[PDB]
Amino acid sequence: PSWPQILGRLTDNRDLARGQAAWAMDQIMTGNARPAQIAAFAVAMTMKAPTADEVGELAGVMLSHAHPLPADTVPDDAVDVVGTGGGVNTVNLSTMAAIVVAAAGVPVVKHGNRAAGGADTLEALGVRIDLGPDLVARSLAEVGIGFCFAPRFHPSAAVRREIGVPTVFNLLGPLTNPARPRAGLIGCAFADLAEVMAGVFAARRSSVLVVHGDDGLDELTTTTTSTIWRVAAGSVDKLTFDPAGFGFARAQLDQLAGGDAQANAAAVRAVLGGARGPVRDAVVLNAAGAIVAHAGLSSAEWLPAWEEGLRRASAAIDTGAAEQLLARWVRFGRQILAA
Amino acid sequence: PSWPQILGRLTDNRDLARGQAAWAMDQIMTGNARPAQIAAFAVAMTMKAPTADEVGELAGVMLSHAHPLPADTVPDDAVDVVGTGGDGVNTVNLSTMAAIVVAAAGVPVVKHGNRAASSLSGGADTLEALGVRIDLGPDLVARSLAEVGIGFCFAPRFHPSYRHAAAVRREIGVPTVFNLLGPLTNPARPRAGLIGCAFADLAEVMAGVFAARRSSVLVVHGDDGLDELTTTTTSTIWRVAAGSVDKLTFDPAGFGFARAQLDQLAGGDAQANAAAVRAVLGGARGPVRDAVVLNAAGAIVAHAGLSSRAEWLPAWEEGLRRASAAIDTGAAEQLLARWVRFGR
């Protein structure tokens, strides 16, 4: 593979040959690509319709250059809870849902970066996001949730300053979690990429629900139905989900909207403290979706899994388990943590 | 307009808004673009289906930076004769020969182009192997037009480069739409031409741009992929005149041309091309001569369309007569000799 061969193929409106996406991504990650090459390739791969083979290569290479967690520190049953975003932002919902899932006893391992987001809302809550692999492993063990801060794990494409627009590279987070959880609830704002991502997770034998609100939300919505790509036993089933089937009132899109880091942090405290309304509803639904994906690792009938997921999610909040998990998480980071 | 706005629109799978292509091109040409911005924009604009509005903007900017010829030195009836190449297609042999034949028939020809290693279908090397002096200034191209009947604008002389051009070229290493717009950036601005294009989508788009320019042009694409009127099969012609595009299928068998095989038409290096030019101009019959005549006649037809009273079949008949006679009477061979003498 070479850049001319690859860029020529792209300009010809063709998909890449096997291995070409991997080679290009590896050149970038090792510092061997020039700004022009990075930019042309990033823009081209954002314009062209995505494929599972190419995305799998891109994400696989990105993942291979990440620091892993120390051996045997990630519970076999750990889950991710994340949206891709992409004018959609549900960092509010995803953050709250992650804390609820962890409080329900399912280990959560998230990953990401600051917003200028995910990480900023966590810092606004007092969570210490900037930890090395050993200490993230210790948080997972001791608190039941960990956060893999991108700068610390993926050292390893500042051309994004160069060109000032996001690219496909910014949408691969769910496939590049350094802790490699085998289950998850993955929200995606673009239906074409959601289906592709589902195919990658199937190839990895993950138990994941890839979710897209039929209102465009990158989470399970409460305003209408959602599309779910249910990934289990190496295969994908696409279906429709109606939360009214579990007693959830239809909400309005603007009721679910996030804000800045401080606005988000206030809502997290409201919801964890028991405030009821459209936001809590959406949090419980997405937490339940993650718990359903987790259940999928071990077996599980769909409707009963949902009823159990929703029971566990609601209880995590209503028992105060969630509010207290957050307190323990803040407490952990404030300790004198030694290597 | 801004780079983030334009690059974002492109990644969104949208066409650009009016003025945005021109802005971007001019930022590049005035030295206000980072290597990543140049490469992202050029690649994106090569991947997206072209549009006449955008290609018009890009070409108009590029043409605004070109070195013009001196006032009153390009005849009103001058024509271009060019194949764009691209897609592995190279008919520099046919195009070079057709241009000399057209000029020898008495229709002024003004071309621009580069050496083979600096362009998709630059035939400057073939001209040079024939003994023609290719790197002349605007004044001497003007004199060549008047005294020989044909002028050649060497691209590095008439088209300035842009900041980071060398690094971008080296790093991406493939042609972009920046290399495909030659027919619309000819510094002598001839109002007629035969324009061969290897990409039917871009051919149709360029026809639209020429139409809005009030040009009389035959934009052509062989149904075998050739960037010329082919003898292998039918061709699409976008016949442009008085502001409209008449898209038709063309079959040279209607004028008695025998079907050839694509291989029989193949070019080679500059020395192989120069040997073939001498042979064809010396009267050597066969598939190559046929293709040259067909394309020279196409240029003469474009030339005839500068008058609103031109009739298609009679124009073809006359163009085919004039092109054959230019070879047979030795006029083409004589013109080439004179062109060689001129540079000395």
Tell me, what CATH number does A137's domain have?
A: 3.40.1030.10
Contact B314, B301 (CB under 8 A): no
- Give dist(CA B183, CA A92) in Å, integer: 55
Which residue on chain B is closest to A34 by alpha carbon? B171
- Give dist(CA B80, CA A291) in Å, integer: 70
Q: To which residue do tokens 């070079």 refer?
A: B96
**First-residue to last-residue Cα distance in chain B:** 50
Q: To which residue do tokens 């280990």 refer?
A: A107
For residue B47, give the nearest of A2, A11, A164 by CB distance: A11
- The DSSP call for residue A83 is E
In the numeric block, which tokens belong to residue A237?
């089933």
Residue type, position B228, single letter = E
Cα torsion A289, A295, A296, A301: sign: negative
Sheet with A226-232: list strands edge to edge. Answer: A145-149, A108-112, A79-83, A183-187, A207-213, A226-232, A235-241
Q: Are residues B113 and B190 in the same domain?
A: yes
B contact set with A (CB within 8 A) = 3-4, 7-8, 10-11, 13, 34-40, 42-44, 46-48, 167-168, 171-174, 176
Q: Are residues A81 and A47 in the same domain?
A: no
Interface test with B, best of A34, A45, A168, A193 (most B CBs within 10 A): A34
Q: Are residues B175 and B307 in the same domain?
A: yes
- Give dist(CA A220, CA A278) in Å, integer: 12
Which residue on chain A is closest to B36 by alpha carbon? A36
For every residue of B232-251, DSSP letters joined together read: SS-EEEEEEETTEEEEEEE-
Q: Are residues B26 and B158 in the same domain?
A: no
Residue type, position B88, single letter = G
- Domain boundary at B66, B88, B113, which? B66
For residue A43, give the nearest of B4, B40, B167 by CB distance: B40
Nearest to B96 by CA among B107, B85, B111: B111
Residues at the binding site of A for 5-phospho-alpha-D-ribose 1-diphosphate are: 83, 86, 90, 92-95, 110-116, 118
Distance from CA of A91 to the nearest CA of B (A): 23
Q: Are residues A130 and A15 in the same domain?
A: no
CB burial of B22-39 (b: ≥16 within 10 Å; e: otherwise) equals bbbbbbbbeeebbbbbbb
CATH assignment of the domain containing B21: 1.20.970.10
Q: Is A159 helix (H, G, I), strand (E, B) or coil?
A: helix
Count of CB pairs separated by less than 8 Å, A with B:
86
Q: Is B122 helix (H, G, I), strand (E, B) or coil?
A: coil
- Give dist(CA B1, CA B14) in Å, integer: 15
Interface test with B, best of A27, A165, A190 (most B CBs within 10 A): A165
Q: Are residues A26 and A102 in the same domain?
A: no
Distance from CA of A259 to the nearest CA of B (A): 23
Residue type, position B111, single letter = K
Residues 6 or more apart in contact with residue B320 via CB below 8 angstroms: B255, B293, B294, B297
Q: Are residues B233 and B339 in the same domain?
A: yes
For residue B174, give the nearest of A7, A47, A162 by CB distance: A7
Q: Are residues A126 and A17 in the same domain?
A: no
Q: Is B59 annotated as a binding residue?
A: no
Residue type, position B51, single letter = T
* Cβ atoms within 10 Å, residue A225: 17
Contact B217, B194 (CB under 8 A): yes
Contact A94, A286 (CB under 8 A): yes
Distances (CA, A) of A6 to A20, B89, B217: 7, 20, 35
Residues 6 or more apart in contact with residue B227 via CB below 8 angstroms: B83, B84, B85, B86, B89, B91, B121, B196, B197, B198, B220, B221
Q: Are residues B11 and B82 in the same domain?
A: no
Bridge partners of B151, per DSSP, are B110
Residue B13: burial class (beta carbons within 10 Å; 0-12, 13-18, 19+): exposed
* Cβ atoms within 10 Å, residue A253: 15
Contacts of B13 in chain A (CB under 8 A): 47
Query: ∠ CA B271-B298-B117 to the nearest 5 degrees?
Result: 30
Q: Is A189 helix (H, G, I), strand (E, B) or coil?
A: coil
Distance from CA of B199 to the nearest CA of A (A): 11
Residue type, position B29, single letter = M
Q: Are residues B171 and B268 in the same domain?
A: yes
Q: Whats the size of chain A, residue-wise?
A: 339
Q: Are residues B36 and B103 in the same domain?
A: no
Contact A137, A174 (CB under 8 A): no
In the numeric block, which tokens belong to residue B151?
């002028």
- Give dist(CA A217, CA A236) in Å, integer: 20
Query: ∠ CA A172-A85-A89 to the nearest 5 degrees?
Result: 155
Nearest to A56 by CA among A198, A219, A212: A198
Q: Does the beta-carbon distance from B43 to A159 stay under 8 Å?
A: no
In the numeric block, which tokens belong to residue B46?
């090569």
Q: Are residues B153 and B192 in the same domain?
A: yes
Residue type, position B14, single letter = R
Distance from CA of A189 to the nearest CA of B (A): 14
For residue A43, give the nearest of B35, B43, B167 by CB distance: B43
Beta strands in B137-279 (DSSP E): 150-154, 192-196, 216-222, 235-241, 244-250
- Give dist(CA A167, CA A172) in Å, integer: 10
Element (H, E) at A241: strand A235-241
In the numeric block, which tokens belong to residue A250?
């239809």
Distance from CA of A176 to the nearest CA of B (A): 22
Q: To which residue do tokens 């992202």 refer?
A: B40
- Resolution of the model in angstroms: 1.9
The number of domains in chain B is 2
- The DSSP call for residue B118 is G
List the determination method: X-ray
Cα torsion A264, A265, A266, A267: sign: positive
For residue A3, give the nearest of B40, B48, B173 by CB distance: B173
Q: Does the beta-carbon distance from B40 to A37 stay under 8 Å?
A: no
For residue A47, give the nearest of B4, B13, B35 by CB distance: B13
Residues 6 or more apart in contact with residue A336 via CB below 8 angstroms: none
Residue B173: burial class (beta carbons within 10 Å; 0-12, 13-18, 19+): middle
- Domain boundary at B42, B66, B90, which? B66
Helices (H), chain A: 3-11, 20-29, 35-47, 52-64, 91-103, 119-124, 133-143, 150-153, 159-163, 191-203, 261-272, 278-298, 302-318, 321-334
Interface test with A, best of B14, B47, B162 (most A CBs within 10 A): B47
Nearest to A143 by CA among A110, A189, A176: A110
Question: What percentage of chain B's residues is helix, strand, coil (to nearest 5)?
Answer: 50, 10, 35
Residue type, position A217, single letter = L
Distances (CA, A) of B256 to A304, A310, B253, B293: 79, 80, 5, 12
Beta strands in chain B (DSSP E): 79-83, 109-113, 150-154, 192-196, 216-222, 235-241, 244-250
Broken C–N links (> 2.5 Å) in chain A, after residues? 86, 116, 156, 299
- Domain boundary at A12, A44, A66, which? A66
Boundaries of domain holding A301: 75-339
Which residue on chain A is closest to B7 by alpha carbon? A165
Q: To which residue do tokens 């480069």 refer?
A: B161
- The DSSP call for residue B259 is P
Residue B341: burial class (beta carbons within 10 Å; 0-12, 13-18, 19+): exposed
Nearest to B250 by CA among B301, B211, B202: B301
